[PDB]
Ligand binder design. Structure first.
Ligand code: JDC
Lengths: 55, 286, 223, 232, 339
């Protein structure tokens, strides 16, 4: 109905007025988070037999 | 000249039976799951054929030398495992047929009568029933000389006494309980199963379920034929040389070797047939 | 190892045994999937608050059927129809007396056309390649007097036959049988029944026994 | 959740008594039960242990082949058949329930107890101190020792602490090392690694008085320590 | 003409949003990633095979630690597994066997269960009575429930079949907030690591970002072209990957909400059932209908290995919160654990 279209148009208006900054910086800090936590990840580097208690 | 070819063919069928049964045992142990009631039965057939294939070099060397340098150390066990194989194979072919018939004609009760636990119970019961004949053979074993060639063979331990009537009664009893009751049960169960499959609607159509019923009937017919035609002239030969008298005639020994060749070729063909025709190994292998 | 760990292992084995003995009766507990169009006599078939799957437990000659009425599930059927792989049969209750009226409230689509579309959707699923359908054509009593006045030309402008009860029933039979795109592995059962008619439990018993004969041929390695 | 005791009393030496315990308020079939004695002048010692479903039955060295423990899961009760009782069997018999999984708290409930009077290696746990002076609002740290390491390869240390108020059943406080039982106020800091283990109370209270015992669950029998009373 | 004017205004404002997010992408993640070292082959052999289920497994969830996980299946059993020792701690019976979601509370005290019965069930694992007892029977959803991730011990978020998400209270059983705006059927839910926002996927190929305290969609994006049925956050909370029935996995951020990277290959034409990250975020783990699981470099969009070994289509996989191992469930009544 018309009420659903109204609800959609103010919902999309509320979603329109949001702060959007560059995707390149998001890729950069995602890469930074990946490289800064690569040491503390058993799936990246397999832990030795002393560690890895699934054995 | 003459024994050169037949020994080579015997060795060839021995080798191919060994490798086929070994691969069947390997896939059923480590590649095909064993939860279905028919899987433990084909496992029993595989184990029985693997236990009986070992006696093929013994049969070949006793055919060659007309004797054996074996003593009573192992002729007793290789004549016990003969009856062990016989009763195990006959009763597994009977019980699998009874399982199929109680699956078809009584499908509401087949869910209760086809559990793997009850299948294992029936398997242990028929193993014990074959082991009774095996231990009777291992406690009634022995060898003796014959006063024409002075060669030795291991058979039923019964000297010249009043045990001839007991031997005839035991022979006629094992003949009845091998090829009257089990064969009649298998034939009746399969005929009733096919007659029940006549009346269903998912197997008695016109496009492809009719030929599915046709190949099911062909399957059970060829299984029964391969069992009966290969295992029966054994029973004619030993029953003929039971009731009256039959010495070492020239035609008697060659027919005996031919019948033994058939009664080992069937156990050689059983892994290949039960691998390429049971459709579960066909589904798994793809 | 530790007595704590050994007793934990024993508890795990005990609940494994309990779970096995609770799930071994699920093979006996045969299951049916009942679905169809709205107000098509589905409410009067089950006689022979979750707002979801209605669970009805009934037995006949010691088989323990289960019906899963999904009439209260108004969501997208494509994302929960895959939860019925292990069902043994599908019960499809549709009314023969719903051929002339389209909705009884509006004029856009016949109930029989929607039933045919639903049957074509539920029969040609990739999850139900080998799941037999127990089609039910109920309320024949209301179809007796609704066929003498209104012919099949309202529902089908291609009939060109006889305006009688038996030929109309046979033509609806022919329409529903031709909706199967693979008659080899699929067999559809159709029963003529009324709202106050017996011999429906016998029909579903015959259907389920045929399907479990097929299953017992399948696991033995023949079919 | 409470356990009800039955039987007991005066018995001639060498006789028998059908000692029983009637459970109520909890699922009896999932709990591995125990029996723990207490002499009128001494501490606790484990007697028997029946597991869930009676699949594993253990006894002490002094009651091996002499006592019989049995349970009735449908009848919701626990029995103990005592054969050839002597003067060394005069004690107070407690019924203890336990489930063993990951994160579970065994020995989490004790029965009220029943009395039995008769007329005229193992990893031992030793409580070196006994009957320490104490004041309310203070902090006391009692300790007990073990004859063997109580840390297996799974990483957890198996020490069980029990508080027994005067006229009350033993109550679990520290089911495993650095673990606090349910219903226990967050002031009991059990610790200890290797051989020596201890319990610490941050602020003493009037209801905290009684006698403390430490119990190890690594092998069998589940022998207890000595007594550590509190004197105001 | 008012409805047409409103539709035209919505269309032009959506076009303005699309133009703004198109001009906002100054660079792509490929030309930033193409100068770093790639991850080697993830030869992750199976370690634990949690046998014991007798039916099709749809859901699993880890805890805050390893060693404990719950699983649900159509046999009516909600099994909690001891991961290291292969043991099972509890075998919770279900009133309705039609289950496709389960979750483990962060406190370790409760588990979730729901499905085609349209009712969420909360069970109490730790009770003085020794058993697993149902505590709250959450009703109020007209559709089938599909995801029931726990906010905390008292707040539960439910993704259901009524095209709406709901936030409930355990002690009252009522919906505190209702998340409305998904046109299509909804079968995804994932909560942020900082417990502030959550995302949900639906049939309209749109993943919507919601706020828990006030309850409206802050952001959305449509980059998929089929039904979305798998969602999870990046470990920093500023990105989330999307799994769909489109043989592609797509990465969206929380800051621009655009197509960061797609994870699709020509050899796979099957849908995705579950998507999860490692704790570093370098590896993206995606389930598939190709009877296996595939790991993805979240930066280079490259296949780092295949977790093959399942006899049927996988349906659920989760990574431990310490990054220890992944437990991929599947339709073959198995639950394999990979390290
Ligand atoms: C299973 C087939 C292939 C052979 C195998 N069998 C195995 C043992 C054998 C090789 C043997 C054993 C010991 C010495 C010797 O020279 C030969 C030789 C007797 C042949 N079995 C027999 O000949 C069985 C068949 C049979 C059938 C009915 C009956 O009342 C008694 C008997 C006993 N002989």
């Amino acid at each position: 109905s018309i009420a659903q279209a109204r609800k959609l148009v103010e919902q999309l208006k509320m979603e329109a007025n949001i702060d959007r900054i560059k995707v390149s910086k998001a890729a950069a800090d995602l890469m930074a988070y990946c490289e800064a936590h690569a040491k503390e990840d058993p799936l990246l580097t397999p832990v030795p037999a002393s560690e890895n208690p699934f054995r | 000249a003459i024994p050169v070819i037949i020994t080579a063919v015997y060795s060839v069928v021995f080798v191919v039976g060994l490798v086929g049964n070994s691969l069947v045992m390997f896939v059923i142990i480590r590649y095909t799951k064993m939860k279905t009631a028919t899987n433990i039965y084909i496992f029993n057939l595989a184990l029985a054929d693997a236990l009986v294939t070992t006696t093929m070099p013994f049969q070949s060397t006793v055919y060659l030398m007309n004797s054996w340098p074996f003593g009573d150390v192992l002729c007793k066990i290789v004549i016990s495992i003969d009856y062990y194989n016989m009763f195990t194979s006959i009763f597994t072919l009977t019980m699998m047929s009874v399982d199929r018939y109680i699956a078809v004609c009584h499908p509401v009760k087949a869910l209760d009568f086809r559990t793997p636990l009850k299948a294992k119970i029936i398997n242990i019961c028929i193993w014990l029933l074959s082991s009774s004949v095996g231990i009777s053979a291992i406690v009634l074993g022995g060898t003796k000389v014959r006063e024409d060639v002075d060669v030795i063979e291991c058979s039923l331990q019964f000297p010249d006494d009043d045990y001839s009537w007991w031997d005839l009664f035991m022979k006629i009893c094992v003949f009845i309980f091998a090829f009257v009751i089990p064969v009649l049960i298998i034939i009746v169960c399969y005929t009733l199963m096919i007659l029940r499959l006549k009346s269903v609607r998912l197997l008695s159509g016109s496009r492809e379920k009719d030929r599915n019923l046709r190949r099911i009937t062909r399957l059970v017919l060829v299984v029964v034929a391969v069992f009966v035609v290969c295992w029966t002239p054994i029973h004619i030969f030993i029953l003929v040389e039971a009731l009256g008298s039959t010495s070492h005639s020239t035609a008697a020994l060659s027919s005996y070797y031919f019948c033994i060749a058939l009664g080992y070729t069937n156990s050689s063909l059983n892994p290949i047939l039960y691998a390429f025709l049971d459709e579960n190994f066909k589904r798994c292998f793809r | 190892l530790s007595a704590e760990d050994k007793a934990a292992v024993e508890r795990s084995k005990m609940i494994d045994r309990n779970l096995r003995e609770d799930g071994e009766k699920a093979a006996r507990e045969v299951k049916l999937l009942l679905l169809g169009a709205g107000e098509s006599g589905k409410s009067t078939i089950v006689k022979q608050k979750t707002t979801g799957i209605v669970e009805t437990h009934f037995t006949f000659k010691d088989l323990h059927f289960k019906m899963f009425d999904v009439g209260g599930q108004r969501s997208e059927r494509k994302k929960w129809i895959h939860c019925f792989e292990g069902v043994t049969a599908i019960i499809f209750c549709v009314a023969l007396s719903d051929y002339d009226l389209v909705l009884a409230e509006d004029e856009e689509m016949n109930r029989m056309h929607e039933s045919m579309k639903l049957f074509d959707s539920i029969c040609n699923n990739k999850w139900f390649t080998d799941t037999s359908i127990i089609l039910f054509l109920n309320k024949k009593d209301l179809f007796e007097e609704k066929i003498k006045k209104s012919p099949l030309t309202i529902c089908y402008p291609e009939y060109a036959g006889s305006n009688t009860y038996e030929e109309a029933a046979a033509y609806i039979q022919c329409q529903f049988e031709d909706l199967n795109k693979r008659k080899d592995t699929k067999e559809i059962y159709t029963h003529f029944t009324c709202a106050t008619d017996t011999k429906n439990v016998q029909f579903v018993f015959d259907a389920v026994t045929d399907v479990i004969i097929k299953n017992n041929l399948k696991d033995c390695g023949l079919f | 959740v409470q356990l009800v005791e039955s039987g007991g009393g005066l018995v001639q030496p060498g006789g028998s008594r059908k000692l029983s315990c009637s459970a109520s308020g909890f699922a009896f079939s999932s709990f591995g039960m125990h029996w723990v004695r207490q002499a009128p002048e001494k501490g606790l010692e484990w007697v028997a242990y029946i597991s869930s479903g009676s699949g594993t039955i253990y006894y002490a060295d002094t009651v091996k082949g002499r006592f019989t423990i049995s349970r009735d899961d449908p009848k919701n009760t626990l029995f103990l058949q005592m054969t050839s009782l002597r003067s060394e069997d005069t004690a107070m018999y407690y019924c203890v329930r336990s489930i063993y999984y990951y994160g579970s708290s065994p020995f989490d409930f004790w029965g009220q107890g029943t009395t039995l009077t008769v007329s005229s290696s193992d990893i031992v746990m030793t409580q070196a101190t006994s009957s320490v002076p104490v004041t309310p609002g203070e902090s006391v740290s009692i300790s007990c020792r073990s004859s063997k390491s109580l840390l297996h390869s799974n990483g957890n240390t198996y020490l069980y602490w029990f508080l027994q108020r005067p006229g009350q059943s033993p109550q679990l406080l520290i089911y495993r090392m650095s673990n606090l039982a349910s219903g226990v106020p967050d002031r009991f800091s059990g610790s200890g690694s290797g051989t020596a283990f201890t319990l610490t109370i941050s602020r003493l209270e009037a209801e905290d008085v009684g006698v403390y015992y430490c119990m190890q669950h690594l092998e069998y029998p589940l022998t207890f320590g000595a007594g550590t009373k509190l004197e105001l | 003409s008012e409805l047409d004017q409103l539709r035209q205004e919505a269309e032009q404002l959506k076009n303005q949003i699309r133009d703004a997010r198109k001009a906002c992408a100054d660079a792509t993640l490929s030309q930033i990633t193409n100068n770093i070292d790639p991850v080697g082959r993830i030869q992750m052999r199976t370690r634990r095979t949690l046998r014991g289920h007798l039916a099709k497994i749809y859901a699993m969830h880890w805890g805050t630690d390893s060693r404990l996980l719950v699983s649900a299946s159509q046999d009516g059993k909600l099994i909690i597994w001891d991961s290291y020792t292969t043991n099972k701690v509890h075998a919770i019976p279900l009133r309705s066997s039609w289950v496709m979601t389960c979750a483990y509370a962060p406190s370790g005290n409760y588990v979730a269960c729901g499905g085609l019965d349209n009712i969420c069930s909360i069970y109490n694992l730790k009770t003085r009575e020794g058993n697993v007892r149902v505590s709250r029977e959450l009703a109020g959803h007209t559709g089938y429930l599909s995801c029931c991730r726990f906010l905390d011990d008292n707040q539960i978020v439910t993704s259901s079949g009524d095209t709406t998400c709901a936030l409930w209270d355990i002690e009252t059983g009522q919906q505190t907030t209702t998340f409305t705006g998904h046109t299509g059927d909804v079968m995804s839910l994932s909560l942020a690591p900082d417990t502030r926002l959550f995302v949900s996927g639906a049939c309209d190929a749109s993943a919507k970002l919601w706020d828990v305290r006030e309850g409206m969609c802050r952001q959305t994006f449509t980059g998929h072209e089929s039904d979305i049925n798998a969602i999870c956050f990046f470990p920093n909370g500023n990105a989330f990957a999307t799994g769909s029935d489109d043989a592609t996995c797509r990465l969206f951020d929380l800051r621009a909400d655009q197509e960061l990277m797609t994870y699709s290959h020509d050899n796979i034409i099957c849908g995705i059932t579950s998507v999860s990250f490692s704790k570093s975020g370098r590896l993206l783990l995606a389930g598939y209908d190709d009877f296996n699981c595939n790991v993805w470099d979240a930066l280079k969009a490259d296949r780092a290995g295949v977790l093959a070994g399942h006899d049927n289509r996988v349906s659920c996989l989760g990574v431990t919160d310490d990054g220890m191992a992944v437990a991929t469930g599947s339709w073959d009544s198995f639950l394999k654990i990979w390290n």
